[model samples]
Target: QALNRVITKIRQVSDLESIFSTTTQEVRRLFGIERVTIYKFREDYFGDFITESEAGGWRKLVGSGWEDPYLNEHQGGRFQQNQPFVVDDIYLGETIWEEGKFNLQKPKRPLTDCHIEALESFEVKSCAVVAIFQGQKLWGLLSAFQNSAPRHWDEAEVQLLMRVADQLGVAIQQAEY
Candidate 1:
């Protein structure tokens, strides 16, 4: 139901910015989360917070270089592997197992102290991020953030979010072509 509504809005857009803005808005509403933003990676491998739909007094990170503490590439390698990264509770984050785990919560993974403090600084309690690919290269990140309290993203939500990422990837390809 939610995905259909989001997809319909996404298909209505003909350009890249509209697609990303529509995606961030609809997904945040569908998930009842605080913010959704597109993080596009630079050739240097670092990314910026580019587009966002936010509510609940969430700090605006858009139009800014990503200065917050995020996990290093070794931690974000899941994104490189065409996988979605989901952390329900910043304090108790989980990693997706590479083989056949697809949204299944296996166990808690270690996070850097800076990573935790970064979210803490923004009152963000949880977040889910999926990588965006263009052809063979990693293009960006699509992430939803929860600001008020910790969240437990279910398997269904994870799977749905993955599908959302895939749809956006197609839109990106079309736009670039």
Candidate 2:
């Protein structure tokens, strides 16, 4: 239903800009979240938020560049494998579910001070991050943020976001062709 609509909207757009903007807007509204964004990676793997949709009262993040040395160094391998990084509560911790499975039984790793500080600066109480790809290339990320409080992301939510990412990847390939 909602997923089908998002896919249709992505297919309807002809340009990369429209795809990014429409995706963020549709996804944010679909999940009723505070913010949604497309973070595009550079050749060096450093990236910036390229497009965003946010509810009122939230801090705007589009145009902000991020350089995570670890992510750049490793090329965000977990994401390349299509696993979403979920943080139910930034203050509590975060987890990486198995590919294709959302299992909360996995041990939660405590967020480091730096990670917490970064998310706090963005007013992100929780987040779910899915990687976007361009054909075989690791392109970027589709991220959803909850700004007010820690919220558990159920399996359906993560799955739908992954579907959206996959669709975005297909759309990118076509646009570049």
Candidate 3:
């Protein structure tokens, strides 16, 4: 249902700003999630939220911070390397480990404390991020947040987000033209 709807809506958009102005909110509607945001990444690893959508009584984070620890140097670098990320429970996966490689023996690092607080501020219990690239370079991200309660995400959801990310990449690539 959402897949077809998103494709149709994206097809109707004719400008760059519309990508941010509408898609984020539309995706939020289909996902039934608390929040969604279109975030841009700068060359120096500093960027802000372009557009944001939220459920009732949700806090606003659009253009709030210049630097986000969650998408800092290392994290963003890896994402640029084509690594998509998601966490089912913030407290369970305090560290963002590779989806299928997380184990006791791997070189895993705990998530940053300040980043945790940043998420906690929004009541974010879970989030999924899929990267969008322009050619070989990472452009930004399509991130969805679940704030009301902690929940487990299915593989299908991740795959769908990846497809949307791919479409967003095409939109950005053309927008730069």
Please report the candidate that would top lDDT against the real structure: 2
Screening candidate 3 with a backbone cut-off below 3 angstroms (N, C-alpha, C), the clashing residue pairs are none
Ordered from best to worst TM-score, the candidate numbers read 2, 1, 3
| Highest-scoring model, TM-score | 2
Give the alpha carbon lDDT tens digit for every residue of 18-101 in model 3. 876677877888788989887888766667778888986787878764477546756576676666666767776633445543
- Listed in order, each prediction's TM-score against the native is 0.87, 0.94, 0.83
Which tens-of-lDDT digit does each residue in 1-177 have in candidate 1? Answer: 888888999999788889988999999989888988888887656668878999888778887765432334454466778777678788887656466354344567856778788768756789887787777677888888898887877767877877888888889898888
What are the Cα lDDT values of the candidates?
0.78, 0.87, 0.74
Worst 10 residues of 1 by lDDT: 67-76
Candidate 3, residue 166: Cα displacement in angstroms equals 1.1
Can you list the residue pairs that collide in candidate 2? none
Q: Once all C-alphas are superposed, what RMSD does model 2 give against the true structure?
A: 1.4
Off by over 4 Å in 2: none
